[PDB]
Amino acid sequence: APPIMGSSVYITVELAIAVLAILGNVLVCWAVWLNSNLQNVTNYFVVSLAAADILVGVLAIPFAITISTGFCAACHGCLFIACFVLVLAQSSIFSLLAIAIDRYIAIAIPLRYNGLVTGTRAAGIIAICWVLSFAIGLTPMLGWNNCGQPKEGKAHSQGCGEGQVACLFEDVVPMNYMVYFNFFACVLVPLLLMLGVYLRIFAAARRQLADLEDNWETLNDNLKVIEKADNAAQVKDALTKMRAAALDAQKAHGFDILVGQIDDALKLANEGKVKEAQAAAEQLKTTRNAYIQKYLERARSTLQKEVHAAKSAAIIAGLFALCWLPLHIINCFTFFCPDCSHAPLWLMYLAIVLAHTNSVVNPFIYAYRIREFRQTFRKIIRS
Numbered sequence: 001a002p003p004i005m006g007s008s009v010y011i012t013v014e015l016a017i018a019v020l021a022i023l024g025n026v027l028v029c030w031a032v033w034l035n036s037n038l039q040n041v042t043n044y045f046v047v048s049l050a051a052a053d054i055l056v057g058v059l060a061i062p063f064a065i066t067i068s069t070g071f072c073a074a075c076h077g078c079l080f081i082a083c084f085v086l087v088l089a090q091s092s093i094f095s096l097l098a099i100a101i102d103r104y105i106a107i108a109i110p111l112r113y114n115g116l117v118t119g120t121r122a123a124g125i126i127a128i129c130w131v132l133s134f135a136i137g138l139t140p141m142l143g144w145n146n147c148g149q150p151k152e153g154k155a156h157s158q159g160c161g162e163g164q165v166a167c168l169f170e171d172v173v174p175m176n177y178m179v180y181f182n183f184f185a186c187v188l189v190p191l192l193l194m195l196g197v198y199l200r201i202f203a204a205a206r207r208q209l210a211d212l213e214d215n216w217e218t219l220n221d222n223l224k225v226i227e228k229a230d231n232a233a234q235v236k237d238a239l240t241k242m243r244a245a246a247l248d249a250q251k252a253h254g255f256d257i258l259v260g261q262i263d264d265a266l267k268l269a270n271e272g273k274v275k276e277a278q279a280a281a282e283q284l285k286t287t288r289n290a291y292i293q294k295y296l297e298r299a300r301s302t303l304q305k306e307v308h309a310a311k312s313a314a315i316i317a318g319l320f321a322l323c324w325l326p327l328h329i330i331n332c333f334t335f336f337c338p339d340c341s342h343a344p345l346w347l348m349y350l351a352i353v354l355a356h357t358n359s360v361v362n363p364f365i366y367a368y369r370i371r372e373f374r375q376t377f378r379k380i381i382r383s
């Protein structure tokens, strides 16, 4: 068929994706810029990622449309057209890894997270990540390209001038770079690191929930022990275990009452006043129902929240992988199997369109899983 027809379908889909990418990610940026409840370190990496997607629509997709035509161009200019999307993809990877690490710090060490992770260092990290993304993505421009061995015939058939080439991705970008350097080292390794980080996150959260329920169970079971005890030494056993568990749970003003009441009962148990020690320990039920239950519930709620936020971040990371892996896998076949027939052109553009689609989904994930983003989107739209 006349190449323009299939091209028209590919171009039309690309432009539609560009519109949606720009609109959605501009909305994310606007939401963070207005709402102070969304202005944190985590959402600063979210904005860095949104900027990458905005640039995908404004530059990467136009570049992709351009390089699909095979227009005559200087090989190094064609190279920039081809590799700029690699810059944006690498920036996305760094932002995703930063979010994963930020969440891990938030749950692993909630105490020092406020001082360890701050917005100033975050801005510096984002800057560095963009510089390294330009370095990685544009590494072919430094010499790892196929400009030294142009396809002279394909340049003459299209009437390209002296020093020009038919600007085609696989003609100028080496495939060993895309497979070994870009995919394996710069895409797959970071993603597997993110996987390990999120496993540590969820493992931690599960362990802390188990610790909370364990401390609640021990506090009630030793209460039963104190009830049915028969001598002062046994009451002392249960209470000593209690006191340690109390100063323990305090770490991860009502507790003051608790530990104090344990001390009262423990002193009276040391005086051989068994009976009055169970009464003094039975006072603990009051402190538990009014103070230790509320703490258990509030803490469990906060950890469930951290799990939810981590799940949202992992969803976006996984969607990034889902959208980009097909193109990388096609490159692996093009590189590792020269005996295989190259992936058909329609499948190539389907994979490119999918990678680009990734720049549209993140705003939707925010709106469907994060209430603050959802409500801010609503306010912006209604106005």
Ligand SMILES: CC(C)CCC[C@@H](C)[C@H]1CC[C@H]2[C@@H]3CC=C4C[C@@H](O)CC[C@]4(C)[C@H]3CC[C@]12C
Residues within 6 Å of the ligand: 072, 073, 074, 076, 077, 078, 080, 081
């Ligand atoms: C800040 C933003 C808006 C600036 C964007 C500038 C972009 C579009 C510019 C910067 C460098 C430019 C390229 C430089 C050299 C060549 C080789 C030539 O044979 C064809 C055009 C081509 C491939 C240019 C296309 C346009 C280009 C990519």
Ligand SMILES: CC(C)CCC[C@@H](C)[C@H]1CC[C@H]2[C@@H]3CC=C4C[C@@H](O)CC[C@]4(C)[C@H]3CC[C@]12C
Residues within 6 Å of the ligand: 188, 329, 332, 333, 336, 337
């Ligand atoms: C999916 C995540 C976990 C890891 C990525 C796995 C990738 C690197 C794997 C999955 C399937 C693999 C391909 C399966 C089959 C072939 C055909 C063979 O003649 C050359 C190697 C090649 C082309 C493999 C290269 C590596 C490959 C693309």
Ligand SMILES: CC(C)CCC[C@@H](C)[C@H]1CC[C@H]2[C@@H]3CC=C4C[C@@H](O)CC[C@]4(C)[C@H]3CC[C@]12C
Residues within 6 Å of the ligand: 321, 322, 325, 326, 327, 329, 330, 333, 340, 341, 342, 343, 344, 347
């Ligand atoms: C869900 C994501 C992560 C994985 C998707 C895997 C996709 C990209 C895989 C599944 C089957 C694969 C195809 C299987 C066979 C061939 C024929 C060969 O001559 C060229 C490559 C080509 C056309 C492969 C391209 C990549 C392919 C389409």
Ligand SMILES: CCn1c(=O)c2c(nc(/C=C/c3ccc(OC)c(OC)c3)n2C)n(CC)c1=O
Residues within 6 Å of the ligand: 063, 064, 067, 068, 082, 085, 086, 168, 169, 170, 178, 327, 331, 345, 348, 352
């Ligand atoms: C690094 C991410 N990536 C890619 O990895 C990539 C790609 N285009 C191709 C390949 C395009 C292509 C391959 C064979 C063709 O003809 C046989 C062809 O003709 C238009 C285009 N590849 C491998 N693009 C879009 C510019 C891309 O972004």
Ligand SMILES: CCCCCCCC/C=C\CCCCCCCC(=O)OC[C@H](O)CO
Residues within 6 Å of the ligand: 058, 059, 062, 063, 066, 071, 072, 073, 164
């Ligand atoms: C901040 C927002 C600003 C918006 C910025 C707009 C986005 C860039 C658009 C297109 C770049 C790709 C188009 C490059 C086409 C080159 C065609 C050309 O030069 O053709 C000559 C021919 O090949 C003889 O050799």
Ligand SMILES: CCCCCCCC/C=C\CCCCCCCC(=O)O
Residues within 6 Å of the ligand: 015, 018, 019, 022, 057, 058, 061, 062, 063, 065, 066, 069, 070, 071, 072
């Ligand atoms: C945000 C949506 C994007 C809108 C911007 C317009 C898209 C531009 C894309 C491609 C322009 C084609 C450039 C001309 C290449 C030379 C063609 C040739 O000589 O064969």
Ligand code: NA
Residues within 6 Å of the ligand: 049, 052, 053, 089, 092, 358, 359
């Ligand atoms: Na992205």
